Every structure is written in structure tokens, then in C-alpha cells.
Nucleic acid binder design. Structure first.
Lengths: 182, 200, 105, 131, 94, 41
RNA sequence: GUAAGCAGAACUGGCGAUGAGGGAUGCUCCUAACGCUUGGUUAAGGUGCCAAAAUGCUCGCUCAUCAGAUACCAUAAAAGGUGUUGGUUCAUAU
RNA sequence: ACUCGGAAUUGAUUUCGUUCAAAGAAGGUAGGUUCCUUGUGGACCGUUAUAUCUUUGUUCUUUCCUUUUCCUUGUGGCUGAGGAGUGUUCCUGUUUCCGAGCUCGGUUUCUGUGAUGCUGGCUAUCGGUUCCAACCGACGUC
């Protein structure tokens, strides 16, 4: 009943692996990382890829302990996110800082892969979102965020093209439609 | 699953978007008239579309251009081509579909009947505003369609003719709905509350 | 005079089940008046159909029929597949067809 | 330019699963899409609905901004906006289309017997008022 | 892009203004100009204290925001038209 | 259902044990970016 | 070898000996290999019309007085742009 | 092939939600000032007051989603059942309830392996040989 179509199917996951015991080196140092992914499996894939860049570890030489799903605390109300990220253009790599507004962190990251692909043509494979912090209104530094802030904000509905539920739709009509609506 | 005839008003309409709806309905067996084809619209500016129509006039059979692509100047005849462009018209079935279609640039006959509107293929809906568009009546009179200002005169004549019809009808729409309010009182008080459930 | 009181839904023969390049004229293809989704279609499944047409000669009357029935829906639109006793003739295309509303529920 | 996407404006939801139910706005998320809900008894769970889907209604109840779903229900019951919309036209014919759908066969027969009996009396006055 | 933007125009004393639809008649003492603005997506509307003419657009992208001030400059020219006229002196050279 | 209400104090303590740890790293990483601008220039 | 739908090799897979569905059209690409068939389900690939299936839903970018549009594939580069949309980093709102 | 439904479980032992309590805040309500373009206005000051929200406890809620195994009623498609007989004695199922220690034995009616059941039209249709139409396909050798 809840509409599948609006959002991407991102969920946030914590991951914790630890390399692997040896007779030289027993009890290693443990790791932790928050990741965004489709699934409980595909988080672990992305964990081992990212941990390979940091430290001399692999999926064969490593061992994973826990994959905790994380969600929002309170998803009812709207909040500002300052997303840090990197991506790979056809020249080279660039770090960015985007600012997105939605009810959830999952909703923000869904909205960002749309935005990032649409502008910069950045493929899903290249993007790696580094950290997604919650931000106060008096903190966002982007101008498109600032217009929205303030109580009593109003927005008039202009040019009302309605996506008719199917079956409602007919190929011919009589009257010609009315878009200003009022 | 369909009416006997369906007369289309073609003002406000986008040329391909209209034609693609109209094509599929001719194949399903519906008989169609198109009407006021001079006022039909196209996206892009007037200069842009006339430059595209000049690429069309450049085409001809070089051996004997009597034979080759017939460059049809009239708006009615232009719309007719793009509907035929969306049909397998060499096969026998495709030909039958064109037979159903009637296109006019408004005559007698079907001023008296109602004209419908395809809402999906419509400029106020589709073209995001500011984005420049072009009327086919302008584009045709640029390229040697002589009869612009008759289709001005005849329409302007039969709009005055129609507004005379309107004010008869509008007086006797009042007159029925006055006599409705008497008749709704005098029949018993149960059945008045019955109709106000279901709207009438 | 005219036919009094019709108890059928009325329907057009679109074509056959096909690809770009292959008919499968076993399975005819059918549009119904009103009906516009898969959700609206699930009334009409099972329900029995007739192409009627007329001929130059057979058993005391000029008209023929080909009986069939509705099988299953076809795509996210209303359109719905059918099976007739004979395969349907390709003369019957853009051709009217009576969907009766028995068998009931 | 009447009608604003603002807190506590009433909305008819035209597309989507809800289809035809009424809702209140809470908060604007960004320039598309808004934090639509209903406490009750429309019974539309709160969500990030797009702006395209929802026709704005004339009536609003004034409340401040982002809002708890309980504190609608208190501020609703004083005003009764959902009742007041339902008085006016558009509101009436919304309920007509619900109750036309739900007619029995005898209930559809009832209608056309009354409506034809009206037309006997309607035609008698249309001759008499002419005279 | 940008949620709201509104510049306002001062009407001088010996003039009247009648904006029905987009189209703006300006009658003064000397003559009167009418001029249409059915290109621009914009809400023109004069005030309660009727020697001021506000004008606004919601949702203006940065190209289309630059048509708010183009309105004001054209309407201001129509005022100093119907009061004062526009003399253009041209000199011959040879 | 009674044993659900038993440990539900400790359930929220796991939610904090996550969000504290990455919010400290969030904070600690940004101060490293501040020092490299100062020390080089 | 300047290069070639050029010449000569290594490993595996094809074409040749091989149709079917897709790439509009193609011996070699993709899916997939074939006894006659009834029903069901997919693959590659697609859903405005030709054409079976979305003028479906949802979020960005683009206005072209030669827009662009799907691997093999039916060409485009150095160098420019205060056209527009974002980013990185300095300096006083620009 | 599509559906109306439920019953327990896993996570963060509640994601939420909801009743209170204190604390804090701004995208600052009542309240003061004040200002125009008189507004469903804006600046300054105010922290719940004639609106609130968030953090942190607490009041009682099992659904959102997500693990896990399993019982369900509603419509439809394709294929199949046929020369007689007797009838359940054995056999599996469902069921009457009697005893022995959820499990086994004895006993009664009912249904399967042993099910085709009812009914209509025509005695010319059905079918076949020919030619023709229509939609889709379809350009010997080295």
C-alpha cells in the first residue's frame, strides 16, 4: 500500500569485521563502518572494497562479525542533511559537499544519486558517500536550502497537470481542461 | 467500443502527439473528422520549422520530379501526411485506415455537430511555458498556401453565427432549470432528499 | 424497429497475439468498452464471447457465429486475450464482437 | 493567486493509492513534495507525498509549521474543516460519485422512475409558463 | 529555483493605471499608451493605497528573474511618456 | 511480552552507542581539515 | 607497416556445417542452440505510432538560424564560449 | 495466473506512534513596542503565555518494514477421465468413541485406489476436395 515508486531502495547498515586470528598475531583490532546499500549482502561487498583501500585486508583474509541495520530515530518530521561525497569524472576524482532535505537519511541518499547522476553524469559505481550528518537550519551554507527556511512559508500551486489514475483516462474529452484551477 | 463519428477540434494541439493518437484509433476502426487544422501547433519557433520544411522541398526525384515526393502546402494536407507516416499504408489494412479519416482546414456539415478534444496532445498541457511554439496556419502561408485570409473570414463569420445560436440555447437552459425548481417542490418530500444523495 | 435490450459489453478485435515479426493466430486480442486496467479486467475472465458475421449463402439464416471465451488479461491496459473454437479470420480485424456477461461470478 | 501549500491546508488526493481521500498538509519539504497526513477519520498515514498528486482545497485550519499527528486532531475538532468543505459544491459531487458507485439495481431503478415523473411535471410547466 | 521575488513601482500623481489580465493601459493628461505583457510569467497587481504597483513571480529561475526589472523599466517609461513626452534631438553633420 | 519490556532500557543504549561513536568521528575528521589549512599557509 | 574490411603468429570461442528471438537492414555481435505440438514462465531487448507491451510513476540536466537519441557500428580532434547547471579554493556584500 | 485473509516470531527486546514531566531552542506564538506597499505583513525584545516543536526520561500500543515456518477462500485458464459389472472383503483417507501407556489396538457410518454426472440442438451441421481473399512471414554450383 505504501508507494514503492517514489524512493530508491537504499538502507543504511553498520558493518564490523576484524581481519582474522593467527599464531603470530592473536586478537586483532576490530573495525567499524556505516554504509548505504540495497541489501544486507551488498553492504558487506562495499565494506571489503572500502576496507581494502584503508588497510591490508581482504574478504579471504578477513572475517565479518555483525551487519546491523540502522534506521532514522524519528522519521515523522523534516530535517536538513549535509552530505559529504566523492565521485570519479572522466578526468579524475573530486570531493563534493551537497545539501539535501528529506524526512530520512535513506530519503536523502536516494535523492542525491538522482541529483548527482542528473548533473554530473556520475555513474552508481563511482560515487561513495562519505558521511551523512544532520544539520541545523542555521548551518546549511547553500542558497537553495536557505530560501525554504522560515515559518509561514507559502507556495502557490501553479499550472495543475494531474497524473490521472488509470481508468480515469480517456482518449477523447469534450470541454478542454482548466490549469489555473483556483 | 466507440462512437459513430468523432470530430476533433485541432486548435491548441501538437501535431505529432495528435497524429499518433489519431492513427491508432483509425486502426481500431473509429471513423474520424479533423476540423480547424490551420490552428494546430508545433514545438520550436516559426523560423526553425520553416527551415525544416525547406529541407523537405529540397527533396525531389532528379530524373523526373513529376513522379517524386509531393510537397503538400495546405495545413489539412500536412496533418494528413503525418497520420499516414504512422501507418503501414502500403499494405491493404493500412489503406483502410486512411479511408476512415476525413480532414478539413470548418465547413458546413459539422459546425452543427460537437467537436471533441484529445487532452494528452495539447499545448497548454505539454509545452513548458516560455518554450517557443508555432502555428501551422502561419507555417503554411509562409510556404505558398494562398487561403489564409478566407479561413480567417469564414471562421469570423460563423463565430457570429454560433453566438446567435448560443443566446437562444442559454435562454432556454435558464427556462428548463426554472421549471425544474417548481417540479422538484411539488413531487413528495421523500424523493427530493433521495436525489440529493445522487446529485440530481 | 431495432434490437431491444442488450445484455453484452461490446468489443473490438484488435489482432492476434504477436511479436514484431510473428503472428500466433491461436490467441486473439480484444478491447472492451469502459475497461481500462488489469484490475478492471478480472470481472471478464472466463466470460463467453461471439464474433458474428454474415455470408452469401447456411442452416436457414444468413448469419454465422464463432463462439469463444475470454482467457486472461494483456498488459497494463484493459486489453484481454481470447480463444475461439476456430482461429479468428484476419477479415475480422477492427471488427465488433459481443462479450456476454455469463458465466456469472 | 489564491490557495497556498501551507500548514493545515485541506487537500483532495487525486492520484496514488489513496485515490479520492482527503488530507491535510503539515510541512513543505522542498519545492516539490510536501509532508501530507491525516489524523482522522480520512485515515491516510503520513508520508512525503509529491505536489503533482494533490488538489488544494479552499479551506485551511491555521497551525504552526511541523506538527505532531495528535495536535492536528485537537485543532481539527474545534474548526471541523472537513465538514465545511463538504457543504460546498465540489464537496457535494465528490460524495455523489461515491454513492452513485454503490447503488443497487432497484436503487438505480428508483432514480429513473422519479426522474421521468419529474419530466412530466417539467413539460407541463414548460407549456404553461409559455402560455 | 528561487521561491519568491518582488520589486515595486511608484506611480506618480497625474496618471491612472488599469491592469486587467497582463495588459496594462496607462492614461495620463497628454495621451495614453496600452501595452501587452503576455510573454512574462508574472503577477501584476496594484495596492490599496493606489499610487503603488507591486509585481512578483514565484519559482523564478535566474534567466527568468531578469524579466521582473524589465517590466518595471517599460512601465516607468510609459508614465514619463504620458506626462512629459519623449523628445529625441537629432543633428545633421556634413 | 513482559521480557520485551525488561530489556528495552538496554535497546536504546545500543542506538546511542552507534550514533555517539560516528558523531565523534564526524567531529574529529573536520578538525583535521582545519589544521592542514592553518599549518601549510 | 603511416595505416588498411592489409600481411603473419599465441590461448580459447564461433562462422564454415546453423536455423529461431534481438542489433531497422547484415555468414562471424547479443540471447539461445531446432522431433510434431497444447498451456505456463522468462532471456537478450523493449513499451508515442508503424509494433506485441507505459503518452506509467519519480528526481535532475538540455533550447540547437544543422539539438540529441542505445555496445560491435557505420568517424570526429586540438583549442575556445560572461550559454546555462553545479562543485573546489582564496580575497572584501561584490 | 491473479487474489480476500490471518497466527506466531527476528531486529535497536519500539523504527515509529501516544499520554504526561522537566529542560532547551528558533525557521520566535501570546505579549509588548514600533513600520509601511495595510498583509493568511515585516524588523527589535520575549521562551509558553490566548500556537508549538525538539532533546531526555516516563504511560500503554503490535502494526510500518524486515528475518523465520505455515493454514487459508475467491475467480479463471489448459489437459484428462467414459464397453460392462458387482462393492467395499483388504488397503489409504476422513468420523462415531471404547479401552491400553501426544502414541497404538478394536468398532460404526461416509468417500477414494474400483467417479463419469445430468441435459440440449442437428439427423442437415460437423467434415472433405478445389479455387479465391485477408493479417503476418517469405530475395544448381565453385
Amino acid at each position: 500500500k505504501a508507494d514503492p515508486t517514489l524512493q530508491q531502495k537504499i538502507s543504511q547498515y553498520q558493518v564490523v569485521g576484524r581481519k582474522q586470528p593467527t599464531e603470530a598475531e592473536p586478537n586483532p583490532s576490530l573495525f567499524r563502518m556505516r554504509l548505504f546499500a540495497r541489501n544486507k549482502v551488498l553492504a558487506v561487498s562495499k565494506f571489503w572494497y572500502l576496507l581494502k583501500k584503508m588497510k591490508k585486508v581482504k574478504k579471504s583474509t578477513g572475517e565479518i562479525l555483525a551487519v546491523n541495520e540502522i534506521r532514522e530515530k524519528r522519521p515523522t518530521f523534516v530535517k536538513n542533511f549535509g552530505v559529504w561525497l566523492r565521485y570519479d569524472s572522466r578526468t579524475g576524482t573530486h570531493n563534493m559537499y551537497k545539501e539535501v532535505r528529506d524526512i530520512s537519511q535513506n530519503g536523502a541518499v536516494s535523492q542525491l544519486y538522482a541529483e548527482m547522476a542528473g548533473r554530473h553524469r556520475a555513474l552508481p559505481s563511482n560515487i561513495q558517500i562519505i558521511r551523512v550528518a544532520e544539520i541545523k537550519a542555521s548551518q546549511c551554507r547553500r542558497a537553495h536550502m536557505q530560501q525554504l527556511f522560515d515559518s509561514k512559508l507559502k507556495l502557490p500551486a501553479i499550472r495543475r497537470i494531474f497524473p490521472t489514475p488509470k481508468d480515469k483516462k480517456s482518449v477523447f474529452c469534450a470541454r478542454k481542461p482548466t490549469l489555473f484551477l483556483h | 467500443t466507440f462512437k459513430k463519428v468523432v470530430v476533433i477540434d485541432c486548435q491548441g494541439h501538437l501535431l505529432g502527439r495528435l497524429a499518433s493518437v489519431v492513427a491508432k484509433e483509425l486502426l481500431k476502426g473509429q471513423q474520424i473528422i479533423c476540423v480547424r487544422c490551420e490552428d494546430i501547433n508545433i514545438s520550436g519557433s516559426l523560423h526553425r520549422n520553416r527551415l525544416k520544411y525547406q529541407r523537405f522541398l529540397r527533396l525531389r526525384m532528379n530524373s523526373n520530379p513529376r513522379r517524386g515526393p509531393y510537397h503538400l502546402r495546405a495545413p489539412s494536407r500536412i496533418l494528413w501526411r503525418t497520420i499516414r507516416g504512422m501507418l503501414r499504408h502500403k499494405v491493404e489494412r493500412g489503406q483502410k485506415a486512411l479511408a476512415r479519416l476525413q480532414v478539413y482546414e470548418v465547413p458546413t456539415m459539422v459546425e452543427r455537430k460537437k467537436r471533441m478534444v484529445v487532452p494528452s496532445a495539447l499545448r497548454i498541457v505539454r509545452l513548458k511555458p516560455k518554450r517557443n511554439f508555432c502555428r501551422l496556419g502561419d507555417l503554411s502561408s509562409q510556404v505558398g498556401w494562398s487561403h489564409g485570409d478566407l479561413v480567417a473570414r469564414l471562421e469570423e463569420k460563423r463565430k457570429t453565427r454560433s453566438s446567435a445560436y448560443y443566446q437562444k440555447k442559454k435562454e432556454r437552459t435558464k427556462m428548463q432549470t426554472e421549471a425544474k425548481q417548481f417540479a422538484q417542490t411539488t413531487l413528495p418530500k421523500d424523493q427530493v432528499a433521495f436525489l440529493q444523495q445522487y446529485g440530481h | 424497429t431495432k434490437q431491444p435490450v442488450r445484455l453484452y459489453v461490446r468489443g473490438i478485435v484488435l489482432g492476434y497475439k504477436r511479436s514484431k515479426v510473428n503472428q500466433y493466430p491461436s490467441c486473439s486480442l480484444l478491447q472492451l468498452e469502459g475497461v481500462n486496467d488489469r484490475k478492471d479486467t478480472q470481472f471478464y475472465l472466463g466470460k463467453r464471447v461471439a464474433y458474428v458475421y454474415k455470408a452469401k449463402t447456411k442452416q436457414g439464416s444468413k448469419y454465422r457465429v464463432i463462439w469463444g471465451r475470454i482467457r486472461r488479461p494483456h498488459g497494463n491496459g484493459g486489453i484481454v486475450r481470447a480463444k475461439f473454437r476456430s482461429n479468428l479470420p484476419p477479415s475480422s480485424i477492427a471488427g465488433r464482437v459481443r462479450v456476454f456477461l455469463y458465466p456469472s461470478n | 493567486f489564491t490557495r497556498y501549500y501551507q500548514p493545515g491546508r485541506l487537500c483532495v488526493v487525486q492520484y496514488g493509492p489513496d485515490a479520492g481521500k482527503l488530507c491535510f498538509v503539515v510541512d513543505i519539504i522542498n519545492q516539490t513534495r510536501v509532508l501530507v497526513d491525516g489524523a482522522g477519520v480520512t485515515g491516510v498515514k503520513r508520508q512525503s507525498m509529491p505536489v503533482r498528486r494533490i488538489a488544494l482545497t479552499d479551506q485551511y485550519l491555521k497551525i504552526p509549521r511541523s506538527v505532531r499527528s495528535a495536535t492536528l486532531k485537537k485543532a481539527l475538532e474545534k474548526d471541523d474543516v472537513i465538514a465545511k468543505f463538504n457543504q460546498s459544491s465540489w464537496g457535494k459531487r465528490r460524495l455523489a460519485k461515491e454513492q452513485r458507485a454503490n447503488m443497487s439495481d432497484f436503487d438505480r431503478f428508483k432514480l429513473m422512475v422519479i426522474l421521468k415523473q419529474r419530466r412530466k411535471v417539467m413539460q407541463q410547466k414548460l407549456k404553461s409558463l409559455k402560455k | 529555483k528561487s521561491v519568491y521575488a518582488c520589486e515595486t513601482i511608484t506611480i506618480p500623481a497625474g496618471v491612472t493605471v488599469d491592469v486587467k489580465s497582463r495588459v496594462v493601459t496607462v492614461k495620463g493628461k497628454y495621451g495614453e499608451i496600452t501595452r501587452a505583457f503576455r510573454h512574462l510569467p508574472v503577477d501584476i497587481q496594484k495596492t490599496k493605497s493606489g499610487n503603488r504597483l507591486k509585481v512578483e513571480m514565484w519559482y523564478g529561475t535566474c534567466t527568468d528573474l531578469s524579466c521582473i526589472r524589465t517590466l518595471c523599466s517599460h512601465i516607468k517609461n510609459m508614465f514619463t511618456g504620458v506626462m512629459k513626452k519623449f523628445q529625441y534631438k537629432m543633428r545633421f553633420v556634413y | 511480552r513482559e521480557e520485551h519490556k525488561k530489556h528495552r532500557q538496554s535497546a536504546r543504549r545500543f542506538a546511542a552507542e552507534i550514533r555517539q561513536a560516528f558523531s565523534d568521528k564526524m567531529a574529529a575528521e573536520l578538525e583535521a581539515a582545519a589544521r592542514r589549512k592553518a599549518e601549510e599557509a
